[PDB]
Amino acid sequence: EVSEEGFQIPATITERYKVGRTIGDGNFAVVKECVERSTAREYALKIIKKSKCRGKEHMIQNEVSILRRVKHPNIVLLIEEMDVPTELYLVMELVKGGDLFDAITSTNKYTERDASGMLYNLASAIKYLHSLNIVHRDIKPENLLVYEHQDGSKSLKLGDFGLATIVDGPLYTVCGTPTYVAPEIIAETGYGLKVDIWAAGVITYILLCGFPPFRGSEVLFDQILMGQVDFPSPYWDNVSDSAKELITMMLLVDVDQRFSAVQVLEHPWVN
Template sequence: MPLLVANERPLPESPKLDKFVANNVSLDIQKNVADLVAQNSPVKSRKAKRIRFLANGDRFCKGVIIAITPERYRSFDSLLNELTRALSNNVNLATGVRVIYTMDGQKVSSLDDLEDGKFYVCSGQGDTLKRVDYSVGRSAVPSAGGPPKLKPARSFTRLTNVGHSQSSSLKGTNNHSVRPRIIIVLRNGNRPRKVFRLLLSKRNAPSFDHALSNITDVVKLDTGAVRKIFTSHGSQVTTLDGFFDSDDVFYAYGSERVSADDFALDFEGRALPKLPNKTKALKVQKRQDSSLNISSKVLNNYSVGQIIGDGNFAVVRKCVDKTKNIEYALKIIDKSKCIGKEHMIENEVAILRLVRHPNIIQLMAEHDTPAELYLVMELVKGGDLFDAISRAVKFPESDAQVMTQNLASALAYLHDHKIVHRDIKPENLLVEMDGERLKLLKVGDFGLAQIVNEPLFTVCGTPTYVAPEILTETGYGLEIDVWAMGVILYIMLCGFPPFVSANNDQEELFDDILSGQYGFPSPYWDQVSDLAKDLISHMLQSNPELRFSAEDVLDHPWFEISEN
């Protein structure tokens, strides 16, 4: 059929002309269609944006490169979930990726805000952008608009987050040898040289370069970054394992020369701290049973029995579920004694509703009345650890291991959820016994527990177990629970606390705690292993930044030994 053009006469029919017109019209139509698609279709805007995502505060992390299209990520949350999986091994993102920042600290809130070829920093919830030098991980990102192009699989490849080279960082490193420990670092320079203490663990030192970076931040050499580390014997440390051998004293250097005289130390004599006297265990005064005055709503469901514990404004009784025939502990809180402290009760119940852990007492049910609040709790029949210590005076290490591991596991769970207990003491630790042996421990009484979003300043707790940062009123956090656990472990192994007042004077006791001085006196500690003493010394660190976390406690090699 001849082609008609507006206001033109039909072209004369001709086989050659028809063929020519058909070919050219086909090309024109294809070109026009392509132009229309390019101008009007969303395909152009859906071209993949290739972006490198780094980890907040980790200058050695090379990050991941991800190709982003609307088809691949339907929402901003789907990208956050993918980044959480891709960066799951990074110690700085233990809680997952919740926020993305630009390199200048602006928060990104949508996929449209991400620009092709740019760098972004992934962070956890509530963390601000850490202003470190991310240049190690910032190699060029290929733009989506031109070569070289990445294979699709490359987008999800998890890059190793080590330093300048794998050979220098990981050579000779055995992850199983990385145990939490405190090292002493001397800064090279004029004498007297400054001495620093630093906690290294697999969380803050997954590689040799990470360890050097942490030492650099603490030591602050005048010449800049720490380039070389030597042991006290003059051997250079070149692998991560070197920090976890027998040496615990190290020398930090920049680019300056090393002299043999640098490793000569002058020790000053110092008198031993005054050792604490053995104290007698106090007996818990139990309130006499009184006539039952319990809500009928509770009595309809439970048979209520004898008193098994009490406190300032609550009493705990045994009870039996009439339907299930299961024994529980019934905590009865007298609201008339809580006037002005209602928020503490509400806080305790709210936390108990949240937590589920085998080493934490579980809240089974609650019944609220105008006069009392009834909490039906899991019952642990062995009593509390205070009574167990009173009977046994001290425990074999195997029992102490069970207790400490159970308690550390519970605290690690609580601390992971930003909950500080604030009253870890033997009276609040319930135990199950197997004859004379400790079988299981559970944490109870969350009356002082609180979710921590910022430093706390309220002075609370029990004097013997209170951490020094509570007394100084400079602000405290989750670390205070580990201090209390260290005091309890000390008591379990010898029968008396590390900090005491000979005159039973509280101010004197607090001064003793603030001094941080304690010992392992003979003969009480002669049969206790060095590993147990080492763990205690890491838990009873006056500086909370050097103190073990609950996770660090669980990683300690003491739990791998067993008594013959």
């Protein structure tokens, strides 16, 4: 069985799953809808194209090592994995509401009730990862999935563990998306778990006004290193002081003063 992209879907996958349409894509993966034949239950099939070397070998990947460990309602669950020489197949929980990048483009901005609930979901996921010493390093809207409840309410689920790792002393790899990257990453002075809180702070800021706190014009990186968070008029005039205070504590350049996920969850705006 060959997909439209040319993927040679393993026999064991096609035996138990009916592979459907592409529901999402990224730089490294193609994600499809699929249906477990025995139950008619829907799942997502994530297909990761592995990095090729000279010769017949392919480079090894880290994502499954982290995904196997993580089980939380605000994290996309891994169901099964199938490694073949050229690609890796991941059967995951299907999140029918799509991603937060498309949601933000469609809706523009959110109410404080909606944004606070979304931050509670994200900070809940981060608290759980940080309890396991796992830093995600790629928290941003395209990696957040919108779960739609039977009553119409929504919850966020964190996905894409492609850059995730274990923090056992400071990390130095410069990685991430400029809009969401913590100043200590760009500064190359050593970073840890709280780069995820900075990313969450940037997302919360975007949810309430529709644009990021550091937009640049070099100026972008200088803005991030200085960390001056502005709440410009009229866009932020009707937003509460409580929301602004929490976003400020999440976007502190001083990592020791910056909130932990626990401190975010304890803040009155998310309670």
